[PDB]
A paper describes a structure:
The TRAPP complexes are nucleotide exchange factors that play essential roles in membrane traffic and autophagy. TRAPPII activates Rab11, and TRAPPIII activates Rab1, with the two complexes sharing a core of small subunits that affect nucleotide exchange but being distinguished by specific large subunits that are essential for activity in vivo. We report a cryo‐EM structure of the entire Drosophila TRAPPIII complex. The TRAPPIII‐specific subunits TRAPPC8 and TRAPPC11 hold the catalytic core like a pair of tongs, with TRAPPC12 and TRAPPC13 positioned at the joint between them.
However, in the regions of TRAPPC8 and TRAPPC11 located on either side of the core the local resolution was suitable for de novo model building. In the case of TRAPPC8, residues 350–660 form an α‐solenoid of thirteen α‐helices that includes the site of interaction with TRAPPC2. TRAPPC8 (yellow) is formed by thirteen α‐helices and binds TRAPPC2 via helices 9, 10 and 11. The less well‐resolved C‐terminal region (residues 660–1,319) forms the arm that connects to TRAPPC12 and TRAPPC13. This part of TRAPPC8 is not present in the yeast orthologue Trs85, consistent with it forming an armless complex. The interaction between TRAPPC2 and TRAPPC8 encloses a total surface area of ~550 Å with the TRAPPC2‐binding region of TRAPPC8 formed by α‐helices 9 and 11. Conserved regions in TRAPPC8 (Pro559‐His567 in α‐helix 9 and Trp600‐Ile607 in α‐helix 11) form a hydrophobic pocket needed for the interaction. In addition, α‐helix 9 contains several polar and charged residues, such as Arg562 and Lys563, that are likely to interact with key residues in TRAPPC2, including Asp46. Interestingly, Asp46 appears to be particularly critical for the assembly of TRAPP complexes as mutation of this residue causes spondyloepiphyseal dysplasia tarda in humans and disrupts the TRAPP complexes in yeast.
Author numbering: 355 to 385, 424 to 661
Amino acid sequence: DNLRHFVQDYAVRALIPYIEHLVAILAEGVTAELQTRKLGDLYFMFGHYNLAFQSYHQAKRDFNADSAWQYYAGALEMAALSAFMLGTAQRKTYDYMEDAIVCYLTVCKLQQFATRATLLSMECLKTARLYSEVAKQLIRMTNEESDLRSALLLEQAAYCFLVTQPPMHRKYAFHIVLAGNRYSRAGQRKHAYRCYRQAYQVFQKREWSLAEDHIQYTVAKQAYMLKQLEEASRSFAHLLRPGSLQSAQQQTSFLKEYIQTQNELVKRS
């Protein structure tokens, strides 16, 4: 009840003395490189605005050496954090941030660094409306690092690529179903299912039933057991084998579609 916020306000305004103690501790610290980055990120928990820039600078200079570049990587992303409390944000620093991923990706194969580096890129460029860049570097990320992480990152990068402009859903659609397979493979069901649904809706928005027909044969395999049959039935019906140049397996497939629509007709009649 009220006691929580009472102790909360008192503890916050006693931590202001505590953060002052830590400021004294770091002013003592300036008098190792790991000590420097501990200094940085500790006062970044309450986020020093310019000491951000000086930690940025010092970390860059020294961690040119000491080729364990998590120091320097984390340094420039906390420089991006500074850019959040920096109106100019020296927007080329964002370019620096892009730099951050591509080289440091290769520096260490601990992919999580690449992940949240790209995520900070995502958010900060969303603070610039120019999502195109992070769209491209997220799509160049998502091919790799997994077949599962590849999938949810495929849709992340995908909808993000669509964040800048509504149309050109094309490669969006392609890789999001070519990852919806992996979604059915190793993903929590609600996210994979929202994959399938949003992908299919994006299909219908600008129809192009050619590859949608085979992905709707997949809709059917999840409809021959779980989903509704009529959607697959009408999907194959609009393909309409003669004049659509279907193939031997496709004719057999629409035989099976006749089987499913037979189930549907029998259940209706």
